[PDB]
Amino acid sequence: PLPNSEQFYLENDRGEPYLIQVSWPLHWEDKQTGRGPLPIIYIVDGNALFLTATEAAWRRAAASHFAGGGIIVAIGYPLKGKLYDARRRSFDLTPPTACAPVGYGGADVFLDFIENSVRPAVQARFPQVSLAREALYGHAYGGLLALHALFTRPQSFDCYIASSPSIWWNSLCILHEAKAFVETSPSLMVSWGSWEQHPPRWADELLDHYEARKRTAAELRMADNALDLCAMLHGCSRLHALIKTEYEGEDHTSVMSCSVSRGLTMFFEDWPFHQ
C-alpha cells in the first residue's frame, strides 16, 4: 500500500457510507510523530483527488519554503473502476433550492456530516495534534459546495478553495447567497482553466463537433461567472483575502491537478494570505 496514510468508512446520520482517506507528512515515522498545531485540508470528491493531494504535499518536503506540512483528508465514496459517484455527489454537493430536482439540495446535510463526524473522527487519529486551521476544497459541484459553505457558515472553515465552481447550476442560485453574504474573517481561493469557457479546436476535430463544444462551454460560462462573483465579493468586510486564478491552457479536468496542488501548498506554506 501507500506509506503514511490510512482509510476508513464512516456513515452519516441516515446510514449512507463514506470512504475517508487520510495522509500525513512522509518524513514522519508514524502518525504519533505529529505533535502540536498543524493545518488540515478536507477534499470532497475524495476518490478523484486523494493521491495527487497526498503526493503534492509530500513533494513540498524538498521545497525551500516547506514549514512541516499538514494533514490531507479526502472525503469520498465506496467505488470501483471510477472516481465519482454521480448520484451521491449530486445530493451532497448542491445547495437547497425550491426548484432543485429530486436528488439535489443536500449540501447542508453533508457539511454537517463533515463538521460533526469527519472532523472529530480525524481528530481522534491524531490526539496529540491540534488543528491550527482548516481548509475546504472542492472542484466543479465541489467548488459550488465550498462557496455555499463560505456564504452560509463562514466560521466553519478558515479557507475555502473553489476550483472551477459550478456557478451556472440551477439558474445561478449561488449568487443570491453571495449577495446576502456581502450585504450582511476567512479567505477564499477561486480558480478556473482558460480553456473551460473558450476551448481550442482539437487536431482533426470536425466543425459541427467543435461548435457544439463551444456552445456548451459558453452556456456553462465558467470564467465570466467566476469573475462576476469575485467582483461582487471585492472589498467585502467579511472576507480577509480573495485570490482568483485563471490557469492558462487548462480544461475542466486538467486544471484539477494544478488547483489542488496550489491550494494545499498556499494554505500550508503561505498563511495568512495578504489582506
Next chain:
Amino acid sequence: PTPVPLPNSEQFYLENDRGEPYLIQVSWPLHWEDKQTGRGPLPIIYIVDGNALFLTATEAAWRRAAASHFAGGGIIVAIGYPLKGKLYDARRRSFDLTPPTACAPVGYGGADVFLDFIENSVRPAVQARFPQVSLAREALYGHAYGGLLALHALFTRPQSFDCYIASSPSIWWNSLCILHEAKAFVETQSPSLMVSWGSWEQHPPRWADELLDHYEARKRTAAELRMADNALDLCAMLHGCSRLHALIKTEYEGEDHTSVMSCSVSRGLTMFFEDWPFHQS
C-alpha cells in the same frame, strides 16, 4: 482503519547490469477489470524520479476518463528507487540523470547506463506484463536533472522514444554541457519535445516575513541557474530543426521548481495520450 490500496497498479524490483536496484511502479486505466483487459495499441510514458511522481501521474491519467477528449488512456511506468520517508535518492539520481563529461565530479555521468537500463530491462519487463498490448508510442518524462536526462536522450539517441518531456531541465549543469549535444543534434519519423518551467524559478517572489538579505541570496542563486532563459535559448536553438517533428514550450505562471511538477507531469501525459501526433512546429 486499514492501509490505502492503489487499484489497477503493481510494483516490482529490477536491477541494472551494474547490480543497482530500481523500484518499477506501473498503473493502467482505472475502468479496466484487470491488466488483461487492455488489448492492441496503447501509449506508454516512462517517468524518472519515479517515486516522486507515480501517484499524481496515475491519478491524473484516471481523471482523464471523465474528459471529452479521452481515447482509452495508456500505461504509466514510474522508474524509481527503494526509498522510505522521502521521494528522491540524491546519490543514485546524480549518476543516473547526468550525461558523461570529462570535468563531471565523481558520482555523475551515468545517463547512458541508465538509458540502456530503461530500453533493455524496463521496457521488456513492462511489455511482458502486458503481452496482448503493443506499445504504439513511448514518452520519456523527467524533471530537473530528469529534464536534463530527457534532453540528453533526444540529442544522443533520438529514435529511442517518440516524445521527450523535459520539465524544468537543469540546463545549467556542468557549465551548460548539454548545449554541445544540442548543437551537434541540430547540425547533423522525427520525435517531439515538450519543454517547460515555472515563472517563479528564475524570478522568485519574496516570502512573507523573509529578510531582504535572505531574499537577495535566493534571487542570486535563481539568476545563476537561469532556468527560463537557458530553456528559451535552447528552444530557439532547436526551432525549425528538421530532426524534430514538434517543439512545445510552456512557462507556467506562478509555479516554483517543486510546484510546477504537478502541472507538467499532468499536461505531459495528457497531451501524449490524447493529442498525438502534435501539430508541426
